[PDB]
């Protein structure tokens, strides 16, 4: 298991339904879509989808990190006996679970709002506004992968000089990436456990959804939007809405998701990575 630490050199915009509103981090849907667009840029989207569908690449949602501290979302535990807390460090999960344990503050950056206009010559200009998020100086995001492949690294390097998120051609989203294989996180992931914490925006297939929802504390998340290409349907069109579990969810039974197809009435398919990525705890 390896890491992809994303040190950002620019404001980002990772909107949820907006241009004016943004979140601090992105998801596996967006990174899979970005890598698929970089694959069709260099003609390897048949290879990349065959790698991703056969579980040769498996990446979680991008998660925050401050100095030598990797963070994950606050796992929804259904324990019996920190509402403003949202991110607990991944190494501190055992003694966060063993008792009511806050050691240091969580600061990643702060949100912003860019004020832009759409200038007209002989007409009054149109204001609009882009909500952004600027990271702090020695912070960023990381993505957990395992058994990395040279195609994944080539596509990541091509995505590095293209932009991640929204409004990327208009000033945002540039970053640099690094692998930096760690030893503590891989030992934390290799250990089994009775309860497993989801880490990507997954959705089980229709023959395992009942098995997945047994002793489950989940949160559904609507993950859709408009199709970003040029060869799809000669006008802007919204893909199929897919409701996946949120990345902080916690399950008893394991599952492997699917790369669902959300675009069918077009010249090329549109995919949505809802494969499952788990972390075992006790």
């Amino acid at each position: 298991m390896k890491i992809i630490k994303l040190y950002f050199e620019s404001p980002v915009h990772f909107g949820e339904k907006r241009l004016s509103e943004s979140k601090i981090t992105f998801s596996a849907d967006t990174l899979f879509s970005a890598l698929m667009i970089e694959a069709v840029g260099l003609g390897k989207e048949d290879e990349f989808y065959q790698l991703a569908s056969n579980n040769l690449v498996k990446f979680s949602d991008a998660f925050p990190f401050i100095d030598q501290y990797y963070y994950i979302p606050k796992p929804m535990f259904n324990l019996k006996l920190f509402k403003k807390l949202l991110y607990v460090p991944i190494d501190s999960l055992e003694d966060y679970l063993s008792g009511g344990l806050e050691r240091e503050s969580f600061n990643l950056g702060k949100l912003a709002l860019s004020e832009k206009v759409q200038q007209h010559d002989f007409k009054d200009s149109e204001p609009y506004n882009v909500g952004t998020f600027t990271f702090k100086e020695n912070t960023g995001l990381y993505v957990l992968i395992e058994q990395t492949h040279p195609l994944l690294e080539e596509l990541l390097e091509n995505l590095q000089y293209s932009g991640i998120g929204g409004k990327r051609n208009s000033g945002y989203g540039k970053f640099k990436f690094e692998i930096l294989e760690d030893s503590d996180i891989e030992d934390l992931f290799s250990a089994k456990g009775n309860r497993k914490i989801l880490l990507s925006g997954a959705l089980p297939k229709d023959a395992e959804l009942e098995q997945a929802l047994k002793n489950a504390s989940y949160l559904l998340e609507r993950r859709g939007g408009f199709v970003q290409s040029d060869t799809y349907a000669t006008n802007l069109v919204k893909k199929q809405d897919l409701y996946v579990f949120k990345s902080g969810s916690t399950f008893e039974n394991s599952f492997d998701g699917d790369i669902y197809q959300v675009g069918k009435k077009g010249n090329h398919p549109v995919y949505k990575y809802a494969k499952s990525f788990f972390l075992e705890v006790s």
């Binding site: 339904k17 509103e21 959300v262 675009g263």
Partner: protein, 735 residues
Amino acid sequence: MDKINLVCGSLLHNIGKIIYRGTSERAKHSKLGGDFIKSFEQFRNTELTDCIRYHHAQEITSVKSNKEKNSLFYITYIADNISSGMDRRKDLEEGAEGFNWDKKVALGSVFNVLNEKEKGRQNYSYPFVAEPLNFPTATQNQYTTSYYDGLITDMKTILQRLKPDKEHINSLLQMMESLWSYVPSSTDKNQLVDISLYDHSRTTAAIASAIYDYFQAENITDYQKELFDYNATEFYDKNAFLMMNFDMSGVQNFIYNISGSKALKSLRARSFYLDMLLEYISDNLLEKLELSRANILYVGGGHAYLLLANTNKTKAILSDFEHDLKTWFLDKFKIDLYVAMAYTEVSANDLMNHNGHYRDIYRRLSQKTSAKKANRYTAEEILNLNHQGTENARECRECKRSDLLIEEDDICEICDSLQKVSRDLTRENIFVIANEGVLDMPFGKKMSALSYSQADKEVQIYAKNISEIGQNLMTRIDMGDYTYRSDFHEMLEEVEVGINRLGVLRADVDNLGQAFINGIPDDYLSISRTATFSRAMSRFFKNYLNQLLAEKSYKINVIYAGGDDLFMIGAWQDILDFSIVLKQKFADFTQNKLSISAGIGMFREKYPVARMASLTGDLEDAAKDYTKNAVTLFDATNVFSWDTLENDIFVKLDAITKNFEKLDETGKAFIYRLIDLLRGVNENQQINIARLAYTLSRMEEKIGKTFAQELYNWANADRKTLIMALEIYILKTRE
């Protein structure tokens, strides 16, 4: 025998306290109340009369054998006993010959018991007024026999126009809420003195209905042996009650996350939609269980609490209601709204706090509600969510969904209906739910928000303020619906002195949950005391906030009102003016037993409303970091307290507006110059304070001699109070 006589008796007993406190007759109060209903309301329903007249143990054992079994006053007796919170068997009946009852005791406040361990016990009382504003004073109030005579005459005018039936229980509850909300339940020492007659009567009718339904399902006739052959210990220990809750999720995400350019005009419509949605859901469930509205203990902002019987028929109706409500909410608001119906089994000894466990009711209820929120949907509902996704090149402007679009314009139907009702919301509009209407609702009903002669119309009518109680027959539901002008551009153009910015106030009471489950001492816990505390807090926020805003006509639109969340928006000068008086009147209401933390934020009118509410809330949690008395003035770094803001900021601003109104033209340039360099030394360099030591010698003579009496002592070492007062002065003085 029946139910409706028991419900109207359990509401309508203990009226002989307000009869006996208004006359010179010295009978027991049960006899006076029975003679009042029997004599005046000229029809003699024997179950009603025996439920009023015989509800103490002495008169029950006086008329026990010659009076029948299954006679409905044992339920009233045991319901009064449970609702009081302690045993009322050996206590003498109010008005008897064996005690000296003073018939002019004032109603105490519930707040003089709350937080007794750390804030101390007080003794406050409510002065009588003959709405309007009523605050607990720190003086020994005393009522008058004329006051109770006036209440008797009001009951005489308002009881002759009713009749004990299923449709009149709402009017009877509104009778009790209008008149008896300030008369005390008992005139002795602090057993039920803090508890009003309305809250005690409402609670005893709710649990009387629950006990009646539990006995009817378990088909135990002869209640006399099962509540008097012992001290009803066997009944006290069996689970005879359920206390369920509703809990709407994503209410802030429904109100503030709207993407419109004109999204500011729909916030009141969306907040109204959610509140009245919860009101109708709870009232519809009470209709399905054949229970009165007295079984609502608190229907609040985002949640409701109901007490209801522990029968299998009730659980069947609850399961059907939950499934239909879940399906309707999925078919309108896909993930964005969810109502969590969780219930727990509680008992009468558990209600009475006999063995502790009264905290454990709401602890178990919150645990089961969180467990329901964790597993929100089933597998079939998730499959139907993923099955209905289509591809389409259309989307709403505001709520940005692609289903339920209108064919003529790219807009979601529910979101357009919110637009229509926002256009049709006034200061006097009542709201009508029927089959045809504007605003889509369960269960196949829709809501119109019509006023007033169109309400001559089957239907349920929800009014903020009721005109006549008895004859007109509609249910009174209150919310903090104060709007100044209902359009932000025009009211921003009305103000002319300050900057043209919109100000947002977001506040909440510190620790609702802690003061709500373990604020009251354990030895004073009751169902009626929880009811009167919840009703007092909601009554303050909705009714009192509306009346303080209508008193001095502030340029403020109220979006949400409540202890858990408050949200008002308007002219930023009026936000800054009203924040201090909101804190002052909240401290007057709660006797400083509760604290309120606010956050102000100033924005343009065309600022995005979701980002506006979100970062006003992050200044809110910046104030809550400091959950104390704290206000953040437009930024997360400018954190004050309430007393500092009040005293220091307002005397500093009044002094600055006094002596800075010379006027002068380059004197303003000097003001901004000194502000900018005070901020420059606030960047923490002492060469700048050496510069400022040089600078004061430059700027004595510019304002004259008014500097060196108070301004130099404030500007001694770059006070944050002074720069904030100067900042709000130069913000209040612009084009």
